[PDB]
Amino acid sequence: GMKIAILGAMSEEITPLLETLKDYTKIEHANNTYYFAKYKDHELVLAYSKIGKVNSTLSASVMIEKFGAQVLLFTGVAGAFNPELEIGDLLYATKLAQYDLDITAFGHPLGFVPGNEIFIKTDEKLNNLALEVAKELNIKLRAGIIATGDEFICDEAKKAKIREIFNADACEMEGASVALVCDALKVPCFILRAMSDKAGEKAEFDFDEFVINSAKISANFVLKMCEKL
Amino acid sequence: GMKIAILGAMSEEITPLLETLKDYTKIEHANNTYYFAKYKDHELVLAYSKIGKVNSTLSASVMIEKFGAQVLLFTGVAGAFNPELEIGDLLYATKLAQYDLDITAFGHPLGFVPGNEIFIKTDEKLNNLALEVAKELNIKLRAGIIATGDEFICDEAKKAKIREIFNADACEMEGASVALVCDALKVPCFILRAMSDKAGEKAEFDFDEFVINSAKISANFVLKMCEKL
Numbered sequence: 457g458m459k460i461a462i463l464g465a466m467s468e469e470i471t472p473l474l475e476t477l478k479d480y481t482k483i484e485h486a487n488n489t490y491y492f493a494k495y496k497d498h499e500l501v502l503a504y505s506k507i508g509k510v511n512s513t514l515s516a517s518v519m520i521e522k523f524g525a526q527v528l529l530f531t532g533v534a535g536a537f538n539p540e541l542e543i544g545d546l547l548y549a550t551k552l553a554q555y556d557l558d559i560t561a562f563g564h565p566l567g568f569v570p571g572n573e574i575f576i577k578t579d580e581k582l583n584n585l586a587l588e589v590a591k592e593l594n595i596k597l598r599a600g601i602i603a604t605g606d607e608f609i610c611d612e613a614k615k616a617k618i619r620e621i622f623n624a625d626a627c628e629m630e631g632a633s634v635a636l637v638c639d640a641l642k643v644p645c646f647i648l649r650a651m652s653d654k655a656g657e658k659a660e661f662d663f664d665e666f667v668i669n670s671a672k673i674s675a676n677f678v679l680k681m682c683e684k685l
Numbered sequence: 686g687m688k689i690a691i692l693g694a695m696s697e698e699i700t701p702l703l704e705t706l707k708d709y710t711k712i713e714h715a716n717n718t719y720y721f722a723k724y725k726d727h728e729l730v731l732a733y734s735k736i737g738k739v740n741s742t743l744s745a746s747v748m749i750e751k752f753g754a755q756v757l758l759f760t761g762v763a764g765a766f767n768p769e770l771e772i773g774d775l776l777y778a779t780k781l782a783q784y785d786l787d788i789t790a791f792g793h794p795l796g797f798v799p800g801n802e803i804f805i806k807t808d809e810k811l812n813n814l815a816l817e818v819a820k821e822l823n824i825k826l827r828a829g830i831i832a833t834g835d836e837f838i839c840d841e842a843k844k845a846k847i848r849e850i851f852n853a854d855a856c857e858m859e860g861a862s863v864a865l866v867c868d869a870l871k872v873p874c875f876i877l878r879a880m881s882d883k884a885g886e887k888a889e890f891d892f893d894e895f896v897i898n899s900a901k902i903s904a905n906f907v908l909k910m911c912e913k914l
């Protein structure tokens with residue numbers, strides 16, 4: 457079996473996995489805790505990064521460069537843009553962009569810097585495995601584009617703009633950064649999100665109400681994927 | 686001697702060091718090139734990260750976690766906010782914040798996420814070493830606060846807002862993220878910037894005109910610091 461990283465942003469996104477696993481060891485590193493467990497012939501490394509692009513980049517980098525992760529599964533919640541998504545629905549990202557990476561003053565498109573592309577892709581084999589798991593367990597699973605940036609979106613105008621520019625189905629604050637790290641380090645990456653809110657007026661209240669439950673839905677799914685890897 | 690990382694964002698910020706060093710080895714890693722050289726009893730690792738917070742976070746993490754850097758010196762250019770700064774002037778950061786890290790919907794201040802602080806500090810001993818180098822070489826050196834985010838600022842209103850909220854003397858797109866990584870991994874960090882522009886109307890044109898020269902000023906200074914480490 458391979459060494460698998462499971463990464464979230466907040467305690468709520470990862471604690472459900474630790475409760476399921478029960479037996480694990482801890483290491484304090486990178487001003488955070490990294491958790492180690494054996495599960496179905498796989499060595500797991502788990503952590504929550506803390507919120508946002510920088511924190512999630514650091515944790516993905518640590519999990520691969522220091523702890524030797526060979527595959528990385530991201531689990532957590534997101535703000536829904538696609539009106540067909542409801543709170544609780546699962547979306548995996550086929551590709552992701554940073555909507556707030558902006559050198560447009562120099563005539564390049566939003567999300568672009570030299571040497572990189574606007575969109576980073578996730579791993580096709582992991583995505584196909586997720587589709588198999590979803591079918592086997594009768595779980596509804598949607599494929600889409602995720603827009604990542606360092607703002608909590610709770611504004612219909614901003615939602616509409618990001619949706620339009622990137623054809624994005626959801627937003628969050630860690631996906632594109634984690635996917636970029638994994639691509640750069642040649643590690644297959646899967647990004648799964650359960651919707652906690654619709655990223656408009658009162659998104660903060662929906663997020664507060666639904667984060668715990670939506671986080672569990674995503675967490676359960678990525679652990680099921682580990683069984684089939 | 687210690688293992689020293691020297692990091693910039695763009696080729697212009699690091700190529701002057703490579704030209705001075707002359708002899709070095711290259712390793713392709715993390716969708717980038719990392720350069721290795723010996724200088725005055727120190728093993729150096731150098732790179733330009735590519736632009737922005739995610740790219741710079743990844744490079745700092747790689748330099749420390751994979752290549753074992755024990756100190757990190759960041760060199761490059763910046764947009765001046767403090768009206769006493771002129772193009773070409775050197776500023777080292779005493780502390781830095783991410784102005785575009787925004788969960789203010791939840792009633793926290795701009796730049797804050799739970800588990801972290803608004804400002805990250807750089808290393809006092811390195812900062813004092815820089816002051817000694819500046820005095821010895823008769824170079825004007827200013828201490829200040831740097832605001833970091835993923836936008837090229839070329840707008841007087843944005844400049845004024847970021848300046849006001851963070852009491853920032855300059856802006857750039859990599860400092861706070863690099864400083865955060867170094868702090869998290871217990872590596873002393875120094876962030877030096879030479880002004881390339883004043884971050885208002887026509888900042889893009891000043892940046893184009895002055896980036897090469899200002900980048901050399903910063904690069905020369907960090908190499909002088911390596912001699913005294």
Ligand SMILES: CCCCCCSC[C@H]1CN(Cc2c[nH]c3c(N)ncnc23)C[C@@H]1O
Pocket residue numbers: 465466506507508532533534535536607608609610627628629630652653654655656659663788791799
């Ligand atoms: C008590 C501490 C204050 C709560 C701060 C919560 S920020 C949102 C979380 C959840 N995650 C995904 C996400 C869920 N909903 C989102 C939205 N509307 N905009 C941006 N991101 C998201 C990104 C980020 O990790």
Ligand SMILES: CCCCCCSC[C@H]1CN(Cc2c[nH]c3c(N)ncnc23)C[C@@H]1O
Pocket residue numbers: 559562694695735736737761762763764836837838839856857858859881882883884885888892
């Ligand atoms: C086709 C040409 C594309 C050029 C794109 C250059 S973005 C600015 C650089 C330089 N660096 C520092 C910096 C210098 N001036 C800045 C400003 N006004 N705003 C934000 N950052 C900066 C950040 C970033 O690494």
